[PDB]
Amino acid sequence: GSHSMRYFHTSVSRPGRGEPRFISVGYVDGTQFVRFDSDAASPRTEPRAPWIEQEGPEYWDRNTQISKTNTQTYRESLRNLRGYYNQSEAGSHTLQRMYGCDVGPDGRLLRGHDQSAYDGKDYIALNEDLSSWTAADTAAQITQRKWEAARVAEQLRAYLEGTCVEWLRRHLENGKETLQRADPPKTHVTHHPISDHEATLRCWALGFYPAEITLTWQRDGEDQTQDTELVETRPAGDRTFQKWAAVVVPSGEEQRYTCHVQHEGLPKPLTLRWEP
């Protein structure tokens, strides 16, 4: 249905170990398609998905130039942030930024994003209007005033509504056979006794794309939210994802439990039970 293009930037200072490393990765939905790393022997924007490889030299050259400039910009931002927080030169600090755009099924812009964090804490974000900022504290208000004086929100709005959505639509077309293909989970329920009194039922979902999925256990038709152990959805390494959910059940009561699976690739939601 809906799709997103997002870039994830991480810059980390390392006093005494050279200049801060800059890494940028680009994703369409759950699929990484580009990377750049300033610590590479020869830093360059590099393809990470097959469908992006057909872009010509201008694409790789311009993205490399942009990322090399960003490496320098982020180092200056880290110097400024250290001063805004009165921090010493001795410590390592992290600047992260995410930006990009979401489109609906018809390719129309749903919304844009530009948000930053310092040391893992939200710092400043472009509001959904693409015209104003939300600053976390008085340090971020310094950045907000600088960006208001320089009309940065207007620059972001032009990029997000223009280049970003145009290129997301282009990627979705070039990668349509994967980016617009939902692969359903393969599912099964396992049973493992814990003692004479209890057993674990575990409901598995394997091989699905995209990562969004709903996996729940019900007992007599009631959701078992507090009693379910639900692992984080995890990458298989072949584009797909995996997840499981487990409940501890009294011996002999297994047929009262049902596992429910919802995913975009399924013709119909699934209801699974342990099949002894």
């Binding site: 990322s67 910009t73 931002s77 950045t143 960006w147």
Partner: peptide
């Protein structure tokens, strides 16, 4: 394309 980000 990416964009050139603004200094904080």
């Amino acid at each position: 394309y990416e964009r050139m980000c603004n200094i904080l």
